[PDB]
């Protein structure tokens, strides 16, 4: 828990390693104090995959959902705690819950209004993507190349370009490669 814990996953140091999908999920969670089902699964299983323990995951999700008075702890415990425990096997289930790879993410239902799951290289408009990439210090020529990949449907290549420019396709591989480059 020394490096990956409920508090450090909100740090800039750790979150600088997140791919765009995880950044988007963390932003929706930070702003709305909630995520709908597919986003809860995408994010919680990514965080389990980077080493967030069961106890630290319950801290993370309970604090995020009850922040700013969004819901009481009693409501969290009655309506969400079991679902997060289930994703960690803590009620004894033996289902496979491995982190989702990019193909799995892309194959989930596309996000609608109020959804943060999916792949931003597909799901965002070029103008939203461009603004995000500018905030990550990419230049116009870089952005044009990333958008070219997006328009061709090559979302994982777009994401690989972003990795290269800011330093099997899998968000956890993006994280691990980026985090290794901090060490």
Closer residue to ligand SF4 in complex, CB, 63/101: 101
Q: CA–CA separation, 177 vs 167, rounded Å?
A: 10
Q: Are 106 and 175 in contact (CB under 8 A)?
A: no
Per CB under 6 A, which of residues 120..139 are in contact with ligand SF4?
Answer: 120-121
Quote the least distance from Cβ 91 to ligand SF4, whole Å.
Answer: 29
Quote the least distance from Cβ 143 to ligand SF4, whole Å.
Answer: 15
Per CB under 6 A, which of residues 20..39 are in contact with ligand SF4?
Answer: 20-21
Closer residue to ligand SF4 in complex, CB, 6/150: 150
Quote the least distance from Cβ 106 to ligand SF4, whole Å.
Answer: 6
Residue choice 5, 6, 19, 43 for contact with ligand SF4 (CB under 6 A) = 19
* Residue 170 dihedral angles phi and psi, to the nearest 5°: -155, 130
For residue 31, give every residue at least 6 positions away whose Cβ sits within 8 Å of its Cβ, in sequence order, or none: none
Q: Two tokens at 7?
A: 């508090």
Q: How many residues does the chain have?
A: 183
For residue 141, give every residue at least 6 positions away whose Cβ sits within 8 Å of its Cβ, in sequence order, or none: none
Per CB under 6 A, which of residues 138..177 are in contact with ligand SF4?
Answer: 155-156, 159, 169, 171, 174
Closer residue to ligand SF4 in complex, CB, 90/160: 160
**Residue numbers belonging to the annotated binding site for [4Fe-4S] cluster:** 21, 102, 119, 159
Q: Are 88 and 34 in contact (CB under 8 A)?
A: no
Closer residue to ligand SF4 in complex, CB, 40/62: 40
CA 15 from chain centre, in angstroms, equals 10
Quote the least distance from Cβ 1 to ligand SF4, whole Å.
Answer: 25
Q: Virtual CA dihedral for 56, 105, 159, 84, nearest 10 degrees?
A: -10
Closer residue to ligand SF4 in complex, CB, 111/171: 171
CA 52 from chain centre, in angstroms, equals 13
Question: Which residue ranges make up the site for ligand SF4 (CB under 6 A)?
Answer: 19-21, 102, 105, 119-121, 155-156, 159, 169, 171, 174
């Amino acid at each position: 828990d020394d490096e990956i814990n409920a508090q450090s996953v909100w740090s800039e140091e750790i979150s600088s390693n997140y791919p765009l999908c995880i950044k988007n999920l963390m932003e929706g969670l930070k702003k709305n104090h909630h995520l709908r089902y597919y986003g809860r699964q995408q994010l919680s299983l990514f965080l389990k995959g980077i080493g967030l323990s069961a106890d630290e995951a319950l801290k993370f999700w309970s604090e995020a959902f009850t922040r700013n008075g969004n819901m009481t702890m009693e409501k969290f415990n009655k309506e969400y705690r079991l679902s997060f425990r289930h994703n960690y096997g803590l009620e004894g289930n033996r289902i496979n819950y491995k982190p989702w790879d990019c193909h799995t993410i892309l194959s989930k239902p596309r996000p609608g209004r109020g959804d943060y799951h999916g792949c931003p290289f597909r799901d965002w408009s070029h103008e939203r993507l461009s603004a995000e990439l500018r905030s990550m210090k990419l230049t116009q020529a870089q952005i044009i190349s990333v958008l070219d990949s997006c328009q061709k449907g090559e979302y994982t290549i777009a994401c690989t370009k972003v990795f290269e420019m800011t330093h099997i396709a899998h968000p956890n591989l993006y994280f691990e490669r980026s985090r290794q480059l901090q060490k």
